[PDB]
């Protein structure tokens, strides 16, 4: 989940960051 992970780490979004 991102809609409730990324908001709060973005730089740590593992959907992205890893």
Same mark, same amino acid.
């Given at each position: 989940?991102?809609? =409730?992970? =990324?908001?709060?780490?973005?730089?740590? =979004?593992k959907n992205k960051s890893?």
């Amino acid at each position: 989940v991102a809609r =409730g992970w =990324g908001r709060k780490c973005p730089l740590f =979004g593992k959907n992205k960051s890893r």
